[PDB]
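Q: Hi! Curious about what Catechol O-methyltransferase looks like structurally. Here's the sequence.
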Amino acid sequence: GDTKEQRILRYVQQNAKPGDPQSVLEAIDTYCTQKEWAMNVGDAKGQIMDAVIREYSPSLVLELGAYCGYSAVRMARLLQPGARLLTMEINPDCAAITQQMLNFAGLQDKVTILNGASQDLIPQLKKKYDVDTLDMVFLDHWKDRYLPDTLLLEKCGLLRKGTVLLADNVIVPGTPDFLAYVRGSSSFECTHYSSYLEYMKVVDGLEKAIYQGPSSPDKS
Ligand SMILES: COc1ccc(C2(c3cc(-c4cn(C)nc4C)[nH]n3)CC2)cc1
Ligand SMILES: [K+]
Ligand SMILES: [Mg+2]
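A: Let's find out. The predicted structure is below.
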């Protein structure tokens, strides 16, 4: 049975060129702009993502919610050699599409795709995937999971001082608990990046949250 996600991949494979991540991004955005809407794409958002990768030059990136691979392709194309992206996708068919998308784009050696739920996989990163700490986390999965998975990342020792969290859709449909927490906490230095959703004619935004280290115990 045909699916939207299969159609997106087919359109890339037909129209983009293998080993050219930019042609892949442009094919996805054209398709989602002209044929059918899809989650987790957008060049405008992608501009902001590019700037963060460019500025912080992360060597180890965790993505939550790969979907079809748009953001994984977007990020991995800007990674230095030896840098790596781990991306998590809870739906197995979407994981498969993300893998072929990345393969087509020629980025398969930079990315590891994990098929499972974030709260199950995150505490396995140290033991299973030889992670010390993450340089950057991109959150674009289930919105009610942004806050818990962030606390879970902290818990598991995966965050270091200077780790960049970048969270999408914090305005539409919104992640109010997450925003209140990271903005209200001294453990996160937060910058908001507005980005206009052109055809819904509404402002969304990303939140950048830089980890500052954990809250210190009471002293005297
Ligand atoms: C209904 O709104 C949606 C539906 C699907 C998604 C997507 C997603 C979410 C996850 C996920 C959830 N957990 C707990 N862990 C992981 C990993 N993977 N992929 C993007 C495809 C985003 C928003
Ligand atoms: K804060
Ligand atoms: Mg999204």
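A: A fun detail: The first strand starts at residue 60 and ends at 64.
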